[PDB]
Design an enzyme around this catalytic site. Structure first.
Site, PDB file in Angstrom:
ATOM      1  N   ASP A 115       0.698  -1.253  -0.069  1.00 41.43           N
ATOM      2  CA  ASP A 115       0.178   0.281   0.018  1.00 41.43           C
ATOM      3  C   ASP A 115       0.794   1.180   0.014  1.00 41.43           C
ATOM      4  OD1 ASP A 115      -2.301  -1.354   0.091  1.00 41.43           O
ATOM      5  OD2 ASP A 115      -2.421  -1.731   2.305  1.00 41.43           O
ATOM      6  N   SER A 161       1.251   6.661   2.653  1.00 40.22           N
ATOM      7  CA  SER A 161       0.393   5.593   3.273  1.00 40.22           C
ATOM      8  C   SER A 161      -0.910   5.794   2.423  1.00 40.22           C
ATOM      9  CB  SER A 161       0.198   5.855   4.755  1.00 40.22           C
ATOM     10  OG  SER A 161      -0.704   5.149   5.296  1.00 40.22           O
ATOM     11  N   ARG A 162      -1.149   4.738   1.602  1.00 38.45           N
ATOM     12  CA  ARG A 162      -2.577   4.916   0.756  1.00 38.45           C
ATOM     13  C   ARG A 162      -3.810   4.889   1.740  1.00 38.45           C
ATOM     14  NH1 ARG A 162       1.154   2.752  -3.108  1.00 38.45           N
ATOM     15  NH2 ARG A 162       1.340   3.861  -5.071  1.00 38.45           N
ATOM     16  N   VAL A 163      -3.704   3.902   2.787  1.00 40.49           N
ATOM     17  CA  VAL A 163      -4.771   3.894   3.486  1.00 40.49           C
ATOM     18  C   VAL A 163      -5.064   5.120   4.245  1.00 40.49           C
ATOM     19  CG1 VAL A 163      -4.172   1.491   4.240  1.00 40.49           C
ATOM     20  CG2 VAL A 163      -3.527   3.297   5.943  1.00 40.49           C
TER      21      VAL A 163
END
Ligand SMILES: Nc1ncnc2c1ncn2[C@@H]1O[C@H](COP(=O)(O)OP(=O)(O)OP(=O)(O)O)[C@@H](O)[C@H]1O
Ligand SMILES: [Mg+2]
Lengths: 103, 503, 56, 69, 45
Positions: free
Chosen positions: B341, B366-368
């Site tokens: 991610d 941080s793609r989340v």
């Protein structure tokens, strides 16, 4: 070992403004912080000794049972606080002087 | 007693015999044995040699079956008999592995007795599909202000720890492992996180140092150290990530939360490349086989956050990639960056510039996103991220910042103070409330007057003060999970008083 | 814990010494035991017959 | 099982050894002494039959002269 | 994406690196001369 009650280190702690004693007050605040950290570091009393499990795991004869007997008979003393009473008396004298000045 | 228990063990062991499927070693070399016979062998099936070494039948060629050796090849001679175990490679699994150092196959190497594992789980099980998973929301507190602030990690997210050698990747992983102590020894079950550290291609002395570091911090009691050192054969290093992934999948399926840290996945890729080349499999870019993206993809996809229907467990993966001269365009770094991610980027320049940890917040992503943060941490972190982006925009003029605009100088000062806040010592993880308090004291402009060099001393003193005297506010922030307006006013009063009294 | 660890280490050393003697003695003894070798030639023939009956 | 029974007999004979963990091993004494020395060095100096007794004192902050109203 | 770092001008060893090295050496030679003169004057005391 219950902790002794004390008042909060409010702005009145810095209101002392002792003559060349502001460093002393800062050192006292540092001592209070260190005492709080030390109190939080460990519990009131040390952990109990698993004498039965120790004896089960102790192959030695005599050197283990006598050690447990001595540990049970062991009684560490506690420190005295005569300096605390002396400082309390000095603070009482200072409070009397402050009361006279206030009058 | 020793003789009696030894005889009890030997009488307990039963020397049963039975039929098998066997084959002869046509040619053995470089840890690769060409076995004649063995018609009814499954692909990727464990087989044991006459000498006692185990193996994995990878290439099922018509004339011979190519098997990799789990050990030194000197013990395998031409003509030796290769028995068939009849099962795909599997590793012991369960709570019994906690506190133990095991090899790639789960055998105990810490000399603390056999593993009391009651369950056996394979290493090549498919990852959960689209339906069983759920969106990552629960935070995974690493204990580092920079990570938990600007590059948050959720439970069920593959976050990469990428950077050159000697930059702090192992330190980041180990402090993440240490930080989870405050949750494990507590009472809240849904916050406990069982760490699993997989060491790939590292000398046994380094693993011993890491184990001692964990034991001194009382973190081994919830940690599994799967060790596949450089001395071990390439197949063991190849299998170690999968063994650790299965050990984490056990916790994931049972509703518990597991953390898996594949240290040096690049070394696992090197071992797999060696195995593929010695098996005469066709090579590709940088001599890696074509199915090298598959190797890491089918491993990291097993990290997921299951929904409530499947138990609600999780498995957080923290792969480590050792780039060469910061070249992220290389084969394995590109593969792992694409698979995961986000990444936590470390730079040598920042490491020796005083910014330790060396997390480069410009490149770390941080793609989340903020969905993996507490409300208070999210609230402070949005402002901190915006201000740090503004500072990094104007960081070029810091050399000649004296003769600059007032806004530019203000941005430079705020960014310098925030960067000084991001610095943190090694093996000293911070609680989420402490981090949110420090970031609040920073972003709200309570450090602009303070000297930039004095931020660290102020940070430590303020942390000690808030932990000692204002523990109630920190506890309320931790329990509530958000910095409410009343808590905001209380924090304002506390930071104002401490700033006034700091001098 | 000093005594406990010393006792555990002594136990482990005794165990390894005993198993070393056992493994260095059994092989040579049975190599010198023809009267046990001749019956070991038939410990498994009945076991082989049982195994083949299981197969058939 | 007859071979296993012979193994059991050998184990029993080792069990009944009056010397116990002797095994006619000339280096057994040296190895045991080296292991004991290593264990003692790792654990440090200690006594097989003794109890820990000690005492300490802590001096508080000394008074500092400071005159004020 | 290709990026750069700190102190990459001298690493290339081009015209600018040699120029920077020469400028630093010429400046610090004068500074060393001044410091030597001051130290000699002090040592005469
Ligand atoms: N936050 C920190 N502050 C100060 N020193 C640190 C910090 N983090 C790591 N270090 C130090 O930096 C060095 C490298 O750390 P570490 O072993 O984690 O790096 P690495 O890049 O993972 O290592 P390697 O590439 O050798 O596997 C060590 O000496 C460690 O003590
Ligand atoms: Mg490292």
């Amino acid at each position: 070992r219950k902790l002794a009650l004390k008042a909060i280190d409010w702005v009145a702690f810095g209101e002392i403004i002792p003559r060349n004693q502001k460093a002393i007050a800062n050192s006292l605040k540092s001592w209070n912080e260190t005492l709080s950290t030390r109190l939080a570091a460990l519990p009131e009393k040390p952990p109990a000794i698993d004498w039965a499990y120790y004896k089960a795991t102790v192959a030695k004869a005599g050197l283990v049972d006598d050690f447990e007997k001595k540990f049970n008979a062991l009684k560490v003393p506690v420190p005295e606080d005569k300096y605390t009473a002396l400082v309390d008396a000095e603070e009482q004298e200072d409070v009397k002087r402050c009361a006279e000045f206030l009058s | 007693e020793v003789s009696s228990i030894l005889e009890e063990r030997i009488l307990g062991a039963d020397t049963s015999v039975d039929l098998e499927e066997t084959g002869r070693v046509l040619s053995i070399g470089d840890g690769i044995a060409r076995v004649h016979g063995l018609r009814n062998v499954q692909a990727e099936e464990m087989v044991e040699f006459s000498s006692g070494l185990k193996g994995m039948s990878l290439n099922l060629e018509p004339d011979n079956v190519g098997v990799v050796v789990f050990g030194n090849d000197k013990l395998i001679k031409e003509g030796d008999i290769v028995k068939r175990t009849g099962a795909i490679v599997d590793v012991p699994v369960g709570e019994e592995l906690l506190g133990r150092v095991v090899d790639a196959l789960g055998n105990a190497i810490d000399g603390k007795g056999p593993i009391g594992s009651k369950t056996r789980r394979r290493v090549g099980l498919k990852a959960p599909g689209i339906i069983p998973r759920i969106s990552v929301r629960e935070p995974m507190q690493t204990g580092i202000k920079a990570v938990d602030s600007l590059v948050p990690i959720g439970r069920g997210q593959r976050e990469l720890i990428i950077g050159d050698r000697q930059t702090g990747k192992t330190s980041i992983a180990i402090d993440t492992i240490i930080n989870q102590k405050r949750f494990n020894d507590g009472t809240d079950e849904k916050k406990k996180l069982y760490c699993i550290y997989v060491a790939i291609g590292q000398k046994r002395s380094t693993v011993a140092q890491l184990v001692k570091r964990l034991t001194d911090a009382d973190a081994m009691k919830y940690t599994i150290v799967v060790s596949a050192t450089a001395s071990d054969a390439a197949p063991l290093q190849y299998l170690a990530p999968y063994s650790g992934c299965s050990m984490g999948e056990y916790f994931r399926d049972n509703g518990k939360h597991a953390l898996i840290i594949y240290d040096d996945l690049s070394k696992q890729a090197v071992a797999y490349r060696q195995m593929s080349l010695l098996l005469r499999r066709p090579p590709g870019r940088e001599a890696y086989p074509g199915d090298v993206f598959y190797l890491h993809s089918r491993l990291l996809e097993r990290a997921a956050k299951m929904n409530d229907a499947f138990g609600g467990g999780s498995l957080t993966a923290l792969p480590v990639i050792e780039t060469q001269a910061g070249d992220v365009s290389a084969y394995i770094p590109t593969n792992v960056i694409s698979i995961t991610d986000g990444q936590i980027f470390l730079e040598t320049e920042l490491f020796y510039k005083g910014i330790r940890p060396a997390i480069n917040v410009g490149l770390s992503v941080s793609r989340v996103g903020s969905a993996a943060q507490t409300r208070a941490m999210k609230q402070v972190a949005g402002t901190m991220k915006l201000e740090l982006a503004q500072y990094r925009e104007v960081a070029a003029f810091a050399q000649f910042g004296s003769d600059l605009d007032a806004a530019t100088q203000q941005l430079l000062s705020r960014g310098v103070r925030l960067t000084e806040l991001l610095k943190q010592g090694q093996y000293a993880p911070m609680a989420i409330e402490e981090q949110v308090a420090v970031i609040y004291a920073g972003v709200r402009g309570y450090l602009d007057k303070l000297e930039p060099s004095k931020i660290t001393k102020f940070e430590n003193a303020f942390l000690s003060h808030v932990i000692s005297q204002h523990q109630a506010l920190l506890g309320k922030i931790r329990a509530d999970g958000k910095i409410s307006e009343e808590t905001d006013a209380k924090l304002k009063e506390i930071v104002t008083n401490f700033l006034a009294g700091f001098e | 814990d000093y005594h406990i660890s010393v006792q555990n280490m002594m136990r482990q050393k005794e165990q390894e010494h005993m198993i070393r003697w056992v493994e260095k003695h059994v092989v040579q003894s049975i190599s010198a035991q023809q009267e046990k070798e001749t019956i070991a030639k038939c410990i498994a023939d009945l076991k082989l017959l049982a195994k083949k009956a299981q197969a058939q | 099982q007859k071979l296993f029974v012979d193994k059991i007999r050998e184990y029993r004979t080792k069990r009944q050894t009056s010397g116990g963990p002797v095994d006619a091993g000339p280096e057994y004494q040296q190895d045991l002494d080296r292991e004991l020395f290593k264990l003692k060095q790792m654990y440090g100096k200690a006594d097989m039959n003794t109890f820990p007794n000690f005492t300490f004192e802590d001096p508080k902050f000394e008074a500092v002269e400071k005159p004020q109203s | 994406g290709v990026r750069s770092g700190a102190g990459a001008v001298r690493d290339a060893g081009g015209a600018f690196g040699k120029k920077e090295q020469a400028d630093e050496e010429r400046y610090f030679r004068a500074r060393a001369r001044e410091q030597l003169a001051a130290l000699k004057k002090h040592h005469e005391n």
